[PDB]
């Protein structure tokens, strides 16, 4: 079993330098769960990671990708999931920090995420059915489970037919995990989400969505991120810029508030409130609890 | 337009001697339509063509699978579809010859016959949905468009209800041809099936069968053919010899008139009666037909 430390949370919670943290005393590397991190050019919208907050420790999945490409958890838990092997192969100890529930569980659960595609072996058997029988046969078959279906294609249509069987055909953790959330207290939360909204104002996100607009990037994922998207709005003529700004600062808290919710509901995952910034303190608690548990788990598999 | 002949019916109507005959005068090839016979080493079961029946006219797409193998209409499309051209670039007509009508439509209507997947655009587009709105909202979503399968999951299972969207979103002629139909009275018809039958038990179906059935073929197509599971039936002492004869007579029969009924409802299909008629005469009078309409219709086409 390969261990695995996850680190999830709202925004603005602190997760990025208790990362680090427990990453340099743990010998271990960074794998970046946020979907928006991936996109290049990006910096300040998206409050990427900078190289002197990553204070050596090496972090992947950061500007890998184009604005104008997008980037599905499928995506994400291809990369992924070969990393884990590729740190443990390097001896280390690989950390998902941050990112959506649906990347997240994508990689702490394995799920398949294969196509939805239809099987040819079933459609042969369809066609040698028809060719010994005849086209209202088969859609017999098709009103024998499914009436309304049926009553709905012609019946000389055996090529709907074929296809709305086939398509009812289609119808009927692995890791040595560690999880832990980072929270913090609603109104102290939210007064570092608006602050982080002014400083991005105050570093140029106004310019880096200008760049983005001038270049033709519009609908993509990257611009419709809760971040990009207010800007936009405000570049349309729609809506004035201290409203976007106002809208862009919303947007933030509803998200965080939806963030903390959904992970809250995440069964084994051990919280942490961040509210005190006695970090040293903090940091100390958390690595002995990381630490323990995989210990202990490591032992008990043993 | 590539021009294309297609001889159809039932069996035991003359399909074979009257397409040599015409191809002869045509200057053409021979593309067989009839899946089974691919199969080699099955001639008998099959009423596989003789060289001698052929009589020179060169054909194709016999002998050509193990019967092990499977042959799909899509099998047969990718390769009837390329001979044709190919026949027409030695600058002879090509002739489709038998055959079921799965096999005859695939090929004169050149059916697309692709994939079914599921777009992962679409995917993506409702992950981003699920994350950007309640997990419930994407349940109103799927519950909008069919509240049936809804009620049928638990919202918080998100995995479940992307899937139902996904399945839901799912469900959301080139040649210049001349087709002919052979038919002939139902009575004679029947007795010509009935004698082909015996005819084979004559000539060995039962020792063809047994080879087969010795080397371990089975639940393969090839064996599935309505000439081959009443023998197998008997083999597997399911059923008296007697009764897998009678049988095999019988599906012949209900084969043939499904045959006819498919083609009978293609539009374009022009019949020709091969009751015991004489036929120097209407070999002569489809000759004549066929060369006819492929001319005007090419000249219509020069317009």
Same mark, same amino acid.
Not at 47 to 50: F, L, Q, V
Not at 154 to 170: G, Q
């Given at each position: 079993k390969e261990k695995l430390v996850a680190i999830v949370g709202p925004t603005a919670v602190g997760k990025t330098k208790t990362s680090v943290m427990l990453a340099k005393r743990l010998n271990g590397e960074v794998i970046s769960g946020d979907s928006m991190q991936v996109y290049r050019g990006m910096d300040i919208g998206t409050?990427?990671?900078?190289a002197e907050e990553m204070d050596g420790v090496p972090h992947h999945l950061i500007d890998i990708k184009d604005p104008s490409e997008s980037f599905s958890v499928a995506d994400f838990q291809d990369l992924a999931t070969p990393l884990i092997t590729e740190i443990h192969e390097r001896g280390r100890l690989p950390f998902l920090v941050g990112g959506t529930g649906l990347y997240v569980n994508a990689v702490i659960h394995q799920f398949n995420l294969g196509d939805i595609r239809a099987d040819e072996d079933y459609r042969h058997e369809l066609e040698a059915f028809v060719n010994s029988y005849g086209v209202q046969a088969l859609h017999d078959k098709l009103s024998k489970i499914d009436?309304?279906?049926?009553?709905?294609?012609?019946?000389?249509?055996?090529?709907?037919?074929?296809?709305? @069987?086939?398509? &009812?055909? %289609? *119808?009927?953790?692995?890791?040595? @995990?560690?999880? &832990?959330? %980072? *929270?913090?207290?609603r109104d102290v939360l939210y007064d570092r989400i608006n602050r982080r909204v002014d400083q991005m104002v105050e570093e140029g996100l106004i310019d880096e969505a200008k760049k983005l607009y001038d270049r033709g990037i519009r609908d993509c994922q990257s611009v419709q991120a809760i971040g990009y998207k207010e800007m936009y709005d405000y570049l349309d003529g729609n809506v004035t810029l201290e409203e976007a700004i106002d809208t862009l600062k919303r947007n933030s808290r509803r998200y965080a508030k939806r963030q903390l919710t959904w992970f809250r509901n995440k069964a084994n995952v051990t919280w942490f409130d961040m509210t005190d910034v006695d970090f040293?303190?903090?940091?100390?608690?958390?690595?002995?609890?990381?630490?323990?548990?995989?210990?202990?788990k490591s032992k008990l598999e043993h």
């Open positions: 409050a990427k990671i900078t009436p309304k279906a049926a009553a709905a294609i012609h019946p000389n249509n055996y090529r709907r037919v074929i296809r709305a @069987l086939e398509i &009812i055909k %289609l *119808t009927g953790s692995p890791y040595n @995990l560690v999880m &832990i959330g %980072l *929270t913090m207290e040293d303190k903090k940091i100390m608690e958390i690595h002995n609890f990381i630490a323990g548990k995989l210990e202990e």
